Amino acid sequence: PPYTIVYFPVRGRCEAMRMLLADQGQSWKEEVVTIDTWMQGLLKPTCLYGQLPKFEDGDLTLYQSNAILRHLGRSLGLYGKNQREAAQMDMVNDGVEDLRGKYVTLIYTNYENGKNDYVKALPGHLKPFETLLSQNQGGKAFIVGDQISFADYNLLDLLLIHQVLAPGCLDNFPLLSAYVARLSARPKIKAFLSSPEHVNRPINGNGKQ
Amino acid sequence: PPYTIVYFPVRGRCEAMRMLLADQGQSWKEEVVTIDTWMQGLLKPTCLYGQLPKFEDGDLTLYQSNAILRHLGRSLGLYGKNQREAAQMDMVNDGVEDLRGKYVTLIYTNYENGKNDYVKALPGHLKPFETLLSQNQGGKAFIVGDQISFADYNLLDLLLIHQVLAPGCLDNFPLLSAYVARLSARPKIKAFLSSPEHVNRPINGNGKQ
Ligand SMILES: N[C@@H](CCC(=O)N[C@@H](CSCc1ccc([N+](=O)[O-])cc1)C(=O)NCC(=O)O)C(=O)O
Numbered sequence: 001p002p003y004t005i006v007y008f009p010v011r012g013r014c015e016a017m018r019m020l021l022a023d024q025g026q027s028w029k030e031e032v033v034t035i036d037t038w039m040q041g042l043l044k045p046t047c048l049y050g051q052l053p054k055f056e057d058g059d060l061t062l063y064q065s066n067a068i069l070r071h072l073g074r075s076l077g078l079y080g081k082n083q084r085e086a087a088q089m090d091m092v093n094d095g096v097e098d099l100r101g102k103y104v105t106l107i108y109t110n111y112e113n114g115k116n117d118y119v120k121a122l123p124g125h126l127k128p129f130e131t132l133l134s135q136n137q138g139g140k141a142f143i144v145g146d147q148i149s150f151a152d153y154n155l156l157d158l159l160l161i162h163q164v165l166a167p168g169c170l171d172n173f174p175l176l177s178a179y180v181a182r183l184s185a186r187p188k189i190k191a192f193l194s195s196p197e198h199v200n201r202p203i204n205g206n207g208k209q
Numbered sequence: 210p211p212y213t214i215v216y217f218p219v220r221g222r223c224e225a226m227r228m229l230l231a232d233q234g235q236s237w238k239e240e241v242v243t244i245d246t247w248m249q250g251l252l253k254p255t256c257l258y259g260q261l262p263k264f265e266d267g268d269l270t271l272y273q274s275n276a277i278l279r280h281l282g283r284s285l286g287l288y289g290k291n292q293r294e295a296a297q298m299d300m301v302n303d304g305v306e307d308l309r310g311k312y313v314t315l316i317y318t319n320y321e322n323g324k325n326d327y328v329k330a331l332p333g334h335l336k337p338f339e340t341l342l343s344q345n346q347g348g349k350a351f352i353v354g355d356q357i358s359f360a361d362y363n364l365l366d367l368l369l370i371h372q373v374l375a376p377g378c379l380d381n382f383p384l385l386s387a388y389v390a391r392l393s394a395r396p397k398i399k400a401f402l403s404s405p406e407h408v409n410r411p412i413n414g415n416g417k418q
Pocket residue numbers: 008009010012013035050051052053063064065066204205206307
């Protein structure tokens with residue numbers, strides 16, 4: 001510490017880590033970068049890959065949203081209790097990323113014509129997560145193990161944004177519906193989901209949701 | 210152990226882990242699944258996400274190529290010496306994945322028309338890796354730290370396949386050119402790169418390279 005998040009004035013690839021820090025009683029400094037500030041002309045600070053977000057933990061600067069999640073997962077003890085749980089948590093997080101990549105592609109490159117085809121193929125992509133829950137204590141606890149991990153926060157966010165995209169996409173998935181209701185019920189998270197800084201902030205950076 | 214890899218008869222998303230195991234004196238069992246075997250019916254829905262590869266370490270089954278790399282990175286001690294190096298190794302591996310995703314998109318969905326545009330934008334994507342090397346002992350050692358990690362194996366593979374795609378794409382990058390020559394010089398890897406099981410195996414699953 002201290003923690004600092006540099007990103008656009010949207011949820012996107014930072015709402016997951018913002019939920020993690022908030023649930024673990026942590027506090028961070030929000031540093032906004034408008035699209036005007038980003039793209040305008042000759043301006044280049046030191047963006048490794050040229051994109052955002054950028055995280056700062058004490059005197060450690062990091063890039064890549066998932067690399068940041070795994071960092072907080074190691075330092076804050078949210079990466080399982082053994083090798084098996086660690087590997088399974090990566091397998092799950094990667095699956096979440098694959099679907100998140102598709103969602104981003106839809107919103108930014110083919111929202112109008114692709115929406116119908118996306119929502120139609122969606123139940124096929126959400127099914128694996130449903131299967132994972134049943135295999136672990138009947139989906140009573142978390143995606144992997146007994147305690148909450150970084151994978152749970154990323155998965156929760158993926159499902160929350162898909163409920164806005166497709167209103168009843170979880171109806172055919174009992175476990176996933178209860179899983180979202182359960183994790184949202186947690187006092188720390190609930191406070192965040194009902195916070196002005198979260199509500200007033202749009203999901204994506206183009207008005208499409 | 211024992212180690213087992215289930216995948217298509219191509220390099221693709223498994224040549225990196227095959228180099229890692231080979232360099233660490235490990236031995237695995239190769240289990241091939243033809244495209245014909247893929248299209249069947251009842252004997253098919255057994256894959257978590259519905260894709261490959263599938264790795265087996267003793268009595269631990271895993272999916273997602275990157276999750277498998279990180280697993281071998283923890284058990285075989287190829288994940289750095291501290292938190293900083295671990296986070297930086299993830300940041301690098303994720304960058305490699307982003308470019309690998311683009312490469313796969315080109316080869317399978319737009320090889321004919323997209324090739325020229327890809328090769329033209331390529332030097333902009335390889336630049337970050339060049340910058341990383343100079344920042345670490347002038348690119349004398351490895352991508353991160355003093356010892357070889359899983360990130361190095363994945364990066365080496367990404368560059369090797371891009372040299373086939375675009376013959377002189379590394380000419381403008383001194384450090385990356387020496388980095389590939391150095392890691393390829395390693396006796397264990399060199400033996401693998403000159404092995405029949407590797408040579409006779411095509412890079413992608415559609416004849417395009
Ligand atoms: N693999 C990377 C991808 C990072 C990424 O997508 N970065 C985007 C922001 S997320 C998507 C996004 C982009 C822009 C806005 N906006 O409001 O302007 C909102 C959301 C970016 O920097 N875009 C600008 C650029 O490429 O130069 C990661 O996970 O960190």
